Amino acid sequence: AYVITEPCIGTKDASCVEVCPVDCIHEGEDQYYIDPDVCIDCGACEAVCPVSAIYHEDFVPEEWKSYIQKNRDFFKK
Numbered sequence: 073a074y075v076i077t078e079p080c081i082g083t084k085d086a087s088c089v090e091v092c093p094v095d096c097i098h099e100g101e102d103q104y105y106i107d108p109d110v111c112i113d114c115g116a117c118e119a120v121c122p123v124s125a126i127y128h129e130d131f132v133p134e135e136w137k138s139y140i141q142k143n144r145d146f147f148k149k
């Protein structure tokens with residue numbers, strides 16, 4: 073699944089939320105998040121996101137797997 077990290081923080085809007093075939097981009101405190109368990113590993117968002125700030129959950133550094141687990145948290149519990 074393609075999940076948030078860090079470079080998106082407070083950086084612009086749009087060009088991700090509108091593209092997703094399963095609408096699973098939702099809001100966080102500052103930046104948006106993505107439910108990774110819903111995300112069907114389609115990419116797309118990948119291509120439009122500047123420098124792919126949306127990174128695949130295991131390309132995502134262990135440090136930022138915290139955020140993946142956060143995006144999960146948000147929509148699980």
Ligand code: SF4
Nearest residue numbers: 074092111114115117
């Ligand atoms: S990879 Fe596709 S399914 Fe997943 S969040 Fe991005 S646009 Fe949505």
Ligand code: F3S
Nearest residue numbers: 080085087088121125
């Ligand atoms: S920068 Fe953030 S606004 Fe979307 S296009 Fe990337 S997740």
